[PDB]
TrEMBL record, chain F:
<protein>
    <submittedName>
        <fullName>Islet-activating protein S2</fullName>
    </submittedName>
</protein>
<comment type="function">
    <text>PTX oligomer B binds to receptors on the eukaryotic cell surface and facilitates the translocation of the toxic subunit across the cell membrane.</text>
</comment>
<comment type="subunit">
    <text>Pertussis toxin contains five different chains, S1-S5. They are organized into 2 functional subunits: A, composed of S1 (which is toxic) and B, containing S2, S3, S5, and two copies of S4 (B binds to the membrane receptors). Dimers of S2-S4 and S3-S4 are held together by S5.</text>
</comment>
<feature type="domain" description="Bordetella pertussis toxin B subunit 2/3 C-terminal">
    <location>
        <begin position="3"/>
        <end position="111"/>
    </location>
</feature>
UniProtKB/TrEMBL annotation, chain G:
<dbReference type="InterPro" id="IPR003898">
    <property type="entry name" value="Borpert_toxA"/>
</dbReference>
<dbReference type="Pfam" id="PF02917">
    <property type="entry name" value="Pertussis_S1"/>
</dbReference>
<protein>
    <submittedName>
        <fullName>Pertussis toxin subunit 1</fullName>
    </submittedName>
</protein>
<keyword id="KW-0732">Signal</keyword>
<dbReference type="GO" id="GO:0005576">
    <property type="term" value="C:extracellular region"/>
</dbReference>
<dbReference type="GO" id="GO:0003950">
    <property type="term" value="F:NAD+ poly-ADP-ribosyltransferase activity"/>
</dbReference>
Length: 112, 98, 122, 107, 196, 112, 224, 110, 130, 107, 122, 108
C-alpha cells in the first residue's frame, strides 16, 4: 500500500506563513521533466484534499503563486512561502502520476 | 471565451469559403425549440497538420448521414458571428447523445 | 413581355401602366421601369425588387412615381403623377437580374427582355 | 493486464485535439457490449485512440472504426492497460479489434 | 484446420504483463497443441515453477508438469512472461500473382498500428485473407486507395476477383482456417465481361 | 497549348444561387469541371485541379463537397472567380471558370 | 429453384395479420421504382408490391439491431424501453417474384443507362422478393415474437403457428416480372442506415407504433 | 445629378471600324462604373449588347468589342456590315443602383 | 461551485433506508466534474462509495453493494448516498458530494480539482439517533 | 490517332499494380457501348489509366469515374493510343472523358 | 461423386464411363481423368473444362479416347475406343480447380475429391 | 511424355526421418513443374498431401514437409508412425498442360 508520511511535525509560525512543513512522501517521484508531478493536497479537518494543480511544475495552478506542493525523491513539501489564516496545514497524497485516495498521516500546529 | 456545449442538434447548412487567405468552413445547427446556432472554423492553425481536411471529412459525413451530431461552440469577440467549433460528437445513427 | 393599350390624358392627371409576364419571371426577377420620349434618347427611371419590397429611384422621381406588384395577376403596375407637357412618351418595363446572382451571365443578363411599349400622351 | 471485452459495438464516434500534444489528435467515443444491461461500465465503455497528423491519410483503425460504426456490427476488443483522457478523465484505449465470426469466436 | 506458424517467428521476450507489442501476436491453445518442435524448445529452455498465460488458456511449467489448461478469454495476461511471435514471415516464394474469383470481403481486422485485414468468402466458405499496411511491407504505397475500394466492397456485397502476392505471409488471424496473405488488387465482377 | 485566360479583373467572388451540378468533365493531369444548371438552362461552368492554377490548395477540399452535390443533386450556391477563363467544353452556350467555393444554405440566410 | 419459405420482419401483432395480413401500398407496379426506394418514400408511396426475403439471418440481425437501438434510446430516457418485434414465415405461391432477375431483365431491355448498380447490390445483399399487389392471408404460417428489456438486460423469444393457414403444394414463381419503363427521374437508391437496409423493407415493415432517416446509398457508400 | 455625354452620330464606309465613346461628368470612368451598351432597332424595343466592358452576350455578333479608352467607356465595331444601322446607348452605374444613360447615337452607315 | 442542496432531518435512523442527495437547482451538471459521495466526517480518510459524472448512470459501492440501494442519477446530479438498512457502526454526517470542480487549468496540464470542502447538504445532516 | 467513342457507360472498375513502374497504380474498367451486339467487339471495350503514389489523395478522373459508375450515365471518352494489361487482355489508355450533353453533341 | 461399377469386357468394343458429380461441381469445377493399373502406379490421362469445350489429352490416349460434357444426368462421359489388352485398369475421375481461380488454396484444390473408380478388364 | 524416377522402396523405423525423392528425366526439376505429392493407402483413393512447392492443406499432416533439393523434389517425413506408411506418388506439370505421374515408392 501507499505508506507515505503526509504530515510532518513542522513548527509554529504567526499569520502569513505555513503552520505545517514538508512531509516525506514515500510516493515522491523525481520525474525526468524536473517537475514533481504532484498536487498540493490538504486533508486536515474542515476540508478534504484540494488538488488545485497537476504535473507539479510550479505553484498551484489557477491559484495564488504563494502556495506550492511538490514531492521529489524521498521528501514532499506542501508548505510554501506564504499562506492565509486557515488555508494551510496537514498535507495528503495527491499526484499527477496516479490518484489513490489515501488517508493522511495527520499533524497540525496551533493557529493564532 | 465563454464556450458552450449543445447536444442533439441536427446539421442543416454547411459552407466552405475563402475569407482572406485562410480556408474557412461553417456549420449551422437547429432543433425544434432553440434558436439556430452558428459555429465554424477557419485555418488559422497552420495547414501542415491534417486538422482541416479531417474536420471537413467528419462534417460532410455528419451532414450526409443527417444525424444529430452534438457540438461545442466558442463565442466570437464581436457581437454576432460563428466563433469557433472544437468538438464534434455524432450521436447514435438512430439515437441521441450521452 | 406584354403591355397594355394606349392612353391619352390631360395635364395634372395621373397614369397607370400595366406590365405582365410569366409566373417564374414575375416571381424571381428584378424589373426596370424606363421611359422614352419621341426623338430622344432613353431615360432610366427606376428599379424594383421582389424580396425587398422597395423600389429604388433616381432623385428626379423620388416621391412622384409609385410601383405596385400583383401576384394574383402576376403584373406590375406603374403610377405616374404631376404630368407636364414634355412627358408624352412611350413607356417600357425591362427584365433585370436574377434574385440571388451577380451580373455576369452569358445566356441571360441585364436588359435581356423588353416589352413592346405603352404610349401615353398628355 | 490487458483486458478483453466481448461483442463490442461502437455507439458514438468523436474527434478532439490532443490536450498534451499539439501535433497529435484523439479519435474516440462510446461503445457497448451487445445485449447487456445499461447499468454497467461494459455497457458504456469509453474507447479512445491517438491519431498522428504529420502525414495525411487514414490509419487502419480509422477505416475499421468508421465502417463498423456505420454498419453497426459486433466486434470484440482487446484493450488496455494505458487509460486515456476522455475530457481529462480516465477512459479505455484500444489495442486489438476483431470482428466476431459466430458463436465460437464471439460468446 | 488451423494454420501453424514456424519456429522462426517465435521472437524473443516480447509481451510484458500481457501487453503484446504492436508488431507481434499472442498464441492460443490450438497453436501450441498442434505444434511439436516448439514444445520441445519451450520445455528445453523454460524452467520450472512458472505459470504462463495463453490467449485463452494457461500453461504450467515443468514443476507443475508443463500442462495446457482451458479458461475463459483474458485470464492469461495476469502473469509477466508472454509467448508472442512476429506476425510476418518472408516466405521466399516467387513473385507470381494469384487470383480468386467471385468472393466477398468480410471480417475486418485492425489492431495497434498493424495491418487492415479482410477475409474473402465464396459459397459460404472462407477462401483467403488479405492485409496491407502503410508502415511496412513492399505494398506500403498500395494502401492509400485500396482501402477506399475495399471500403465499398465491404459496405456492399458485390462479387470481386481478388489478387494476392505470396512473397510474404501473415498470421494476424488466430484460429484461422486459412492462410492470410498480402493484397495486390481488386476487380469488380461484371458477368458479361468474361471476368466473373 | 495553354488553357488559362486571365481577364485580370480584381479578386471578386461571383455567386450564382439555386443551381445544380451536371455534365461532369475530367482529364489527365488537369482539372475536373461541371456545368451548373438552373431551371433547365446552363448558367456557368466551374473547375477544380491539384496540378496547376493558383487555387491548387483548394482541390483536396472542394472535390469532397463537389462529390456530395453530384450524388444527391443538391441545389447549392456556387462561388466562382473570373481571373481564369476556361474552354474545356465544346460548342458551349456558357462560360467555364475556376471554382472557388460551395455553399449549401437555406434561402435568405446569412450563412450563404 | 424458388424457395418455398420467404421471410419478413414486421411489428404488427399476429392477432390481426393472421386474419387480414399485408397489402400493397398502391398501384405503381414499376420494379425500378420499388428497388430504388422512390416509390416507397413518404409522399410517393404507391408501390404495387409487398417486400419479403428468403433469408432468416437477415431478419434476425435486423430485429436484434433494432433491439440494441431501442435499448440505447432507453439510455437517453425517451420512452418505455421494452422492445417487441415479429418475424413472419410465408409459404410461396405463384404471385411472388425475385428482385434480382426482375432488375436484370429490366436493365437488359432498356439498356445500361436505366440501371443502378447499387440497386441490384442491395437486392442481392437483402435477398429481396416482391409479392404481387397482395400477400394472401392463406400463406402466412409461422410467427416469431421477440421481446426484450434493457435496464434489466433480458431477452425472450417465442414461437407461434397460424391455424387458419391452408396447406397446398406451392412454390415461388420461377419466371421474372416484366413491366414498362418508368418515366420518373431517379436521383438515387434510397436505403436505411445502421444496418444498411432497403428503404421500402424498413418502411413497410414499420407499423403505427417517427419518420425514417432515409439516405441515398451512393453518397456514403464511398469514402468521404 | 450625374450626366453622361455620348456621341450624336457617326458614319464610316462599309468594311471600316467605328469607335463610340461615352463619358461621365463625375470623373474618369473605371471598372467600378460598370459600363453598359444597349442597342435599338427602328420600330422595335432596344436590345442589350455589352455589359461590364468585356462581356459579350450570345446574340452579340463577334464584330463588336468594348473596353476603356482615354478614361472613356468605349466600344469598337470592326467589319461594319451595311445592316447594323441602329441606335446606341451607354449606361453608367453609380452608388445606390443609380443608372444614367446617354443621349443615344443614330449609327447609320452609308 | 454548484450550490449543493439537500432536505431532511439531521438524523439517520437505524434499521431504515437512510438517503442523502445533492438535488442541485441551478448548479446543473455542465461545469461540474465528478461528484462522488462519501461518509468521512468521523475517521477522516479518503474513500469513494458512489459514482457520478455527466452521463446519468446508477451503480453500487465496494464497501457494501447490497446495503446501499443503487441510486446515482448522474444526469439529475443526485449523487445520493442511500444506505438501505444502514449499519450504525459508522457514525458521521455523510455527504453526497458535488465537487467544487476545478476546470482545465493551463499550469496543471490535466484535471486539477480545487475542491477542499466540495459540497453537501446544508442542513441535511446524518446522525445515529431516533 | 486516338479513338473517341460515345454512347457508352462503365460497368466494371478495378485497381492493379504497374508492372514496370513500382510507384504507380492502374485503375481499369470495362465499357458497354449501348446498341452494340453481344458478339460485337465494342460492347466490352477496355480502358485503363495510371495514378501517382507520391501525391496522396484522389485524382479527378478517379472521382468522376466513381460518380459515373454509381449512376451508369451514358458517357464519351478518348481511348488510345497506348496499350496496357487488364486481366490478361489488352486495354487502351484513357486521356480525357466527358458526359454526353444531348443528341446534337452525343449522337 | 457416384460412379457406376465397371465390368470385364472383350477387345474390339468401347467403354463409356460416367463421372457423376454435384450441380455446382458440374457447372464450375475442372475434372481430371486418370488411370490406375493393378499393382502399378497411376498415369494421368487428361483434363476437361466444362465451358471452354476443349479437353486436353495426353498423347498416350490421344486419338484413343473421347469426352463429352453431358448436362441432363449431370455426368461427364469418357469413352475408350479400340480396347487393347494393356488397358485393363480402374479409371478415376478427380476434381481440379474452380473455373477462374489459380491453384493455391488451403481449403480445397486439385485432387481433393476423388471418385470410387470404374474398372475395365480385357 | 517424360518419366519421373523414384526408388522402388525406402525403409525407416518409427521416430525416424526418411526422404523420398522424385527426379525429372529431362533435367533438373524446375519450380514451374509444380510438383504434387500424393498419398495412397490400400482401400482408399489418393489425396494431395502437398501442392505447388511447400503449401499444405487443412488435413495435411504437420510432420511432413516438401522442397526442391538437388534439382529434384524431396519430401521429408520426420518421426514416422505405423499409420502413415503407404504409397507416395510424385506428379509433375509440363508444357502443354501435361501432368506426369510417378512409378511410386513403397514406404517402410
Amino acid at each position: 500500500d501507499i505508506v507515505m508520511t503526509q504530515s510532518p511535525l513542522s513548527l509554529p509560525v504567526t499569520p502569513g506563513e505555513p503552520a505545517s512543513i514538508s512531509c516525506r512522501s514515500s510516493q515522491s517521484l523525481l520525474h525526468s521533466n524536473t517537475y514533481n508531478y504532484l498536487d498540493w493536497y490538504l486533508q486536515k479537518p474542515g476540508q478534504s484534499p484540494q488538488l488545485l494543480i497537476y504535473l507539479g511544475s510550479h505553484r498551484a495552478s489557477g491559484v495564488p503563486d504563494r502556495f506550492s506542493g511538490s514531492g521529489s525523491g524521498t521528501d514532499f513539501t506542501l508548505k510554501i512561502s506564504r499562506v492565509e489564516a486557515e488555508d494551510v496545514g496537514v498535507y495528503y497524497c495527491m499526484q499527477s502520476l496516479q490518484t489513490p485516495w489515501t488517508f493522511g498521516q495527520g499533524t497540525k500546529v496551533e493557529i493564532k | 471565451l465563454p464556450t458552450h456545449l449543445y447536444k442533439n442538434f441536427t446539421v442543416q447548412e454547411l459552407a466552405l469559403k475563402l475569407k482572406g487567405k485562410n480556408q474557412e468552413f461553417c456549420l449551422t445547427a437547429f432543433m425544434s425549440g432553440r434558436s439556430l446556432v452558428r459555429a465554424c472554423l477557419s485555418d488559422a492553425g497552420h495547414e501542415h497538420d491534417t486538422w482541416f481536411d479531417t474536420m471537413l471529412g467528419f462534417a460532410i459525413s455528419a451532414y450526409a448521414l443527417k444525424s444529430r451530431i452534438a457540438l461545442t461552440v466558442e463565442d466570437s469577440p464581436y457581437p454576432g458571428t460563428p466563433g469557433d467549433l472544437l468538438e464534434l460528437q455524432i450521436c447514435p445513427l438512430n439515437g441521441y447523445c450521452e | 413581355l406584354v403591355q397594355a393599350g394606349g392612353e391619352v390624358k390631360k395635364p395634372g392627371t395621373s397614369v397607370n401602366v400595366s406590365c405582365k409576364a410569366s409566373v417564374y419571371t414575375f416571381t424571381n426577377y428584378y424589373l426596370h421601369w424606363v421611359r422614352q420620349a419621341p426623338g430622344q434618347g432613353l431615360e432610366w427611371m427606376g428599379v424594383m425588387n421582389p424580396s425587398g419590397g422597395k423600389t429604388i429611384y433616381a432623385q428626379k422621381f423620388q416621391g412622384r412615381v409609385t410601383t405596385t406588384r400583383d401576384t394574383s395577376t402576376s403584373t406590375v403596375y406603374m403610377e405616374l403623377r404631376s404630368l407636364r407637357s414634355e412627358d408624352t412618351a412611350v413607356y417600357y418595363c425591362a427584365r433585370g437580374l436574377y434574385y440571388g446572382d451577380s451580373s455576369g451571365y452569358f445566356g441571360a443578363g441585364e436588359f435581356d427582355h423588353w416589352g413592346q411599349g405603352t404610349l401615353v400622351i398628355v | 493486464y490487458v483486458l478483453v471485452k466481448t461483442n463490442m459495438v461502437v455507439t458514438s464516434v468523436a474527434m478532439k485535439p490532443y490536450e498534451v500534444t499539439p501535433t497529435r489528435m484523439l479519435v474516440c467515443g462510446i461503445a457497448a457490449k451487445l445485449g447487456a444491461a445499461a447499468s454497467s461500465p461494459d455497457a458504456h465503455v469509453p474507447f479512445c485512440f491517438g491519431k498522428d497528423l504529420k502525414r495525411p491519410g487514414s490509419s487502419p483503425m480509422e477505416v475499421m472504426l468508421r465502417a463498423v460504426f456505420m454498419q453497426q456490427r459486433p466486434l470484440r476488443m482487446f484493450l488496455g492497460p494505458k487509460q486515456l483522457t476522455f475530457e481529462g478523465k480516465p477512459a479505455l484505449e484500444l489495442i486489438r479489434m476483431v470482428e466476431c465470426s459466430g458463436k465460437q469466436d464471439c460468446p | 484446420g488451423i494454420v501453424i506458424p514456424p519456429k522462426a517467428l517465435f521472437t524473443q521476450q516480447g509481451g510484458a504483463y500481457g501487453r503484446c507489442p504492436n508488431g507481434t501476436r499472442a498464441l492460443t491453445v490450438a497453436e501450441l497443441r498442434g505444434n511439436a518442435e516448439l514444445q520441445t524448445y519451450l520445455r528445453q529452455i523454460t524452467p520450472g515453477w512458472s505459470i504462463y498465460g495463453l490467449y485463452d488458456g494457461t500453461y504450467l511449467g515443468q514443476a507443475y508438469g508443463g500442462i495446457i489448461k482451458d479458461a475463459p478469454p483474458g485470464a492469461g495476461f495476469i502473469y509477466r512472461e508472454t509467448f508472442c511471435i512476429t506476425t510476418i514471415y518472408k516466405t521466399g516464394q516467387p513473385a507470381a500473382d494469384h487470383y480468386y474469383s467471385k468472393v466477398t470481403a468480410t471480417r475486418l481486422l485492425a489492431s495497434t498500428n498493424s495491418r487492415l485485414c479482410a477475409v474473402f468468402v465464396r459459397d459460404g466458405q472462407s477462401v483467403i485473407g488479405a492485409c496491407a499496411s502503410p508502415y511496412e511491407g513492399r505494398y506500403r504505397d498500395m494502401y492509400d486507395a485500396l482501402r477506399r475500394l475495399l471500403y465499398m466492397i465491404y459496405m456492399s456485397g458485390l462479387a470481386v476477383r481478388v489478387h494476392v502476392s505470396k512473397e510474404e505471409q501473415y498470421y494476424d488471424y488466430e484460429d484461422a482456417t486459412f492462410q492470410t496473405y498480402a493484397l495486390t488488387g481488386i476487380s469488380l465482377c461484371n458477368p458479361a465481361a468474361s471476368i466473373c | 497549348i495553354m488553357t488559362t485566360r486571365n481577364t485580370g479583373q480584381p479578386a471578386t467572388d461571383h455567386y450564382y444561387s439555386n443551381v445544380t451540378a451536371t455534365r461532369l468533365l475530367s482529364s489527365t493531369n488537369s482539372r475536373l469541371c461541371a456545368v451548373f444548371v438552373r431551371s433547365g438552362q446552363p448558367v456557368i461552368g466551374a473547375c477544380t485541379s491539384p496540378y496547376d492554377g493558383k487555387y491548387w490548395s483548394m482541390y483536396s477540399r472542394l472535390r469532397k463537397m463537389l462529390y456530395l452535390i453530384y450524388v444527391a443533386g443538391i441545389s447549392v450556391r456556387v462561388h466562382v472567380s473570373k481571373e481564369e477563363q476556361y474552354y474545356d467544353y465544346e460548342d458551349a452556350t456558357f462560360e467555364t471558370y475556376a471554382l472557388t467555393g460551395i455553399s449549401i444554405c437555406n434561402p435568405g440566410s446569412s450563412l450563404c | 429453384d424458388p424457395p418455398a419459405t420467404v421471410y419478413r420482419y414486421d411489428s404488427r401483432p399476429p392477432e390481426d395479420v393472421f386474419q387480414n395480413g399485408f397489402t400493397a401500398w398502391g398501384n405503381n407496379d414499376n420494379v425500378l421504382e420499388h428497388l430504388t426506394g422512390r416509390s416507397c418514400q413518404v409522399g410517393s408511396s404507391n408501390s404495387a408490391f409487398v417486400s419479403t426475403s428468403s433469408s432468416r439471418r437477415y431478419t434476425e440481425v435486423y430485429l436484434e439491431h433494432r433491439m440494441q437501438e431501442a435499448v440505447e434510446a432507453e439510455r437517453a430516457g425517451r420512452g418505455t424501453g421494452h422492445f417487441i418485434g415479429y418475424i413472419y414465415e410465408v409459404r410461396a405461391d405463384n404471385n411472388f417474384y425475385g428482385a434480382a432477375s426482375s432488375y436484370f431483365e429490366y436493365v437488359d431491355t432498356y439498356g445500361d443507362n436505366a440501371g443502378r448498380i447499387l440497386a441490384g447490390a442491395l437486392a442481392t445483399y437483402q435477398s429481396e422478393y416482391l409479392a404481387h399487389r397482395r400477400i394472401p392471408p392463406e400463406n402466412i404460417r409461422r410467427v416469431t415474437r421477440v421481446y426484450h428489456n434493457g435496464i434489466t438486460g433480458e431477452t425472450t423469444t417465442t414461437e407461434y403457428s397460424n391455424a387458419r393457414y391452408v396447406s397446398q403444394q406451392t412454390r415461388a414463381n420461377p419466371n421474372p416480372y416484366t413491366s414498362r419503363r418508368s418515366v420518373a427521374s431517379i436521383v438515387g437508391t434510397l436505403v436505411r442506415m445502421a444496418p444498411v437496409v432497403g428503404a421500402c423493407m424498413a418502411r413497410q415493415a414499420e407499423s403505427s407504433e417517427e419518420a425514417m432517416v432515409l439516405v441515398y446509398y451512393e453518397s456514403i457508400a464511398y469514402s468521404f | 445629378q450625374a450626366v453622361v455625354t455620348q456621341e450624336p452620330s457617326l458614319t464610316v464606309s462599309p468594311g471600316g471600324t467605328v469607335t463610340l465613346t461615352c463619358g461621365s461628368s463625375t470623373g474618369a470612368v473605371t471598372s467600378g462604373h460598370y459600363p453598359f451598351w444597349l442597342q435599338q432597332k427602328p420600330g422595335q424595343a432596344p436590345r442589350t449588347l455589352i455589359y461590364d466592358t468585356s462581356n459579350k452576350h450570345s446574340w452579340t455578333p463577334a464584330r463588336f468589342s468594348a473596353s476603356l479608352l482615354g478614361g472613356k467607356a468605349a466600344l469598337t465595331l470592326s467589319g461594319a456590315q451595311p445592316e447594323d444601322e441602329a441606335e446606341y446607348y451607354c449606361l453608367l452605374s453609380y452608388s445606390g443602383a443609380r443608372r444614367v444613360f446617354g443621349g443615344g447615337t443614330k449609327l447609320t452607315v452609308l | 461551485q454548484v450550490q449543493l442542496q439537500e432536505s431532511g432531518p439531521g438524523l439517520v435512523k437505524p434499521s431504515g433506508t437512510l438517503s442523502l442527495t445533492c438535488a442541485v437547482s441551478g448548479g446543473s451538471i455542465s461545469s461540474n466534474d465528478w461528484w462522488s459521495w462519501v461518509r468521512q466526517s468521523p475517521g477522516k480518510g479518503l474513500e469513494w462509495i458512489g459514482e457520478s459524472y455527466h452521463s446519468g448512470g446508477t451503480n453500487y459501492n465496494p464497501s457494501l453493494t447490497s446495503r446501499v440501494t443503487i441510486s446515482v442519477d448522474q444526469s439529475k446530479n443526485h449523487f445520493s448516498l442511500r444506505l438501505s438498512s444502514v449499519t450504525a457502526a459508522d457514525t458521521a454526517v455523510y455527504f453526497c458530494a458535488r465537487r467544487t470542480i476545478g476546470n482545465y487549468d493551463i499550469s496543471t496540464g490535466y484535471y486539477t480539482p480545487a475542491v477542499f470542502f466540495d459540497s453537501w447538504g446544508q442542513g441535511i445532516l446524518v446522525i445515529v439517533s431516533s
